[PDB]
Amino acid sequence: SFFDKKRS
Amino acid sequence: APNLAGAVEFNDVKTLLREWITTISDPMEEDILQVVKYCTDLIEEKDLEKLDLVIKYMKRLMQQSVESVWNMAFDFILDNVQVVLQQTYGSTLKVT
Amino acid sequence: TANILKPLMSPPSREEIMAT
Amino acid sequence: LNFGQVVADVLCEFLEVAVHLILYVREVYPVGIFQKRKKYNVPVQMSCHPELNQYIQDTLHCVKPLLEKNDVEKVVVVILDKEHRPVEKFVFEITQPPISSDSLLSHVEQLLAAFILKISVCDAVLDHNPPGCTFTVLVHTREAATRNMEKIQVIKDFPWILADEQDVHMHDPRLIPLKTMTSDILKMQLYVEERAHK
C-alpha cells in the first residue's frame, strides 16, 4: 500500500 | 521526529497527502491509520501548528473529493485526533 | 507498526501508588 | 472465524486476573496493594488500589469487542524499565483451531487455571527485573484495519493510539513458554520474552 511504497 | 512515510518536513507531508488523496479513490486502511498515527505523534511531539494545518489541508482535499470514501476517511482521522487532544490538552481542535 | 494499539494513558506509577 | 461475546467475556475476565498476577509476581507494584483471592479454583493476587484497577478494567473493556470478532492476534503485557526500554513481555497468542478437542466453556476453570498456576511460579525461570519498572498493554490485531480502532475507542476518557517501534522492540529476546492449550474454538498460548541482560 501507498505510504509504504512511498519512499521517494 | 514525526514522519509521514518518511516525510518529516511539512510540505513533503503536504505533497505526499495530495498525491495520495488525488491518485487513489479506494485507499487502503493501512494508509489511513498511519495518517492517524502521524497526527497523534504531532500531538505527542508538541506540534499543534503542523497538525492544525495537516488536518485542514486534508479536510479540504478529502471533503472535495467525489469519493464518499475520502469523506468518511476524514471523519475517522479527526475523531481519533480529537479524543487524544481531549486527553492531552483538555481541548478539541476547533474545526470551523 | 500499523496493527499494534495501546492506550494513551500510562498506568499509575509506583509513586502515585505509595499513598492511597 | 469469529469468537462469541461470551467467549470474549471469559477471555477478558481471564486476562484481567492474569495482568494483575503478572504485576505482582514481577513486583511492578509492591505487595502491600495485593489481596489474595480465588479464581479458576486457584489462589491469586489482585490489587486493591482503585486507580490501578480502573486502568486495567478500562484497558480490557476496550479489547473485548475486538475479541468478540476474533480480531486480536496478541494481547501483550509489556514491562518497561526505568528508561522506558522493554525488559519483559508476556504474550497471549490467540488462534482459531479448524473435531475431537476439549470444550472450552465446559472446562473453563480447569483450562485457564493452568495459565494462572504457571504465571504464579514463572519467577523461578525468569531473571529478576530492575527496579522502577512500569507497564503497558499492547494489542496486536490480525489486520491493520480501521474497524479495530472504531471498536477499541469506546471510552472517551481512555483513548488508544497506534504504538511504535520504541514501544515494542526488545533487544536480544529469550523465549520462555509457559502454557499452551487447545479447545473447541480457541487455542491460546502464553509465553515470555525476556531481555538477555536485564
Sequence-ordered alpha helix ranges (H) in C1-20? 15-18
**Hey, what's the cell of D48?**
486493591
Beta-carbon count within 10 A of D95 CB: 13
Residues of chain C with C-beta less than 8 angstroms from the C-beta of B34: 2
DSSP class of B25? S
| Residues of chain C contacting residue B87, judged by C-beta atoms under 8 Å apart | 8-9
Which of B28, B33, B85 to mutate to test binding with chain D, by most D CBs within 10 Å of its CB?
B33
* Residue in D144, D157, D164 nearest the CB of B33: D144
What range defines the domain where residue B79 resides? 1-96
What DSSP assignment string belongs to chain D?
A: ----HHHHHHHHHHHHHHHHHHHHHTTSS-GGGEEEEEETTEEEEEE--HHHHHHHHHHHHHHHHHHHTT-EEEEEEEEE-TTS-EEEEEEEEEE--------HHHHHHHHHHHHHHHHHHGGGTSPPPPTT-EEEEEEEESS--HHHHHHH--BTTB-EEE--HHHH--SSEEEEEEEEE--SS-EEEEEEEEES--
Buried b (16+ CB within 10 A) or exposed e, B69-94: ebeebbebbbebbbbbbebeeeeebe
Q: How many domains does chain B have?
A: 1
Residues of B in contact with C8 (CB under 8 A): 40, 84, 87-88
The Cα diameter of chain D in Å comes to 48
Cβ within 8 Å of residue D172, ≥6 positions away: D195, D196, D197
Cβ D162–B87 below 8 Å, yes or no? no
- Domain ranges, ordered by start, for chain D: 1-198
The domain spanning residue B46 has which CATH number? 1.20.58.1280
List, in order, residues 6 or more apart from B31 with CB less than 8 Å away.
Answer: A1, A2, A3, B20
B33 near C CB under 8 A? yes
Domain D1-198 has CATH 3.90.550.10: no
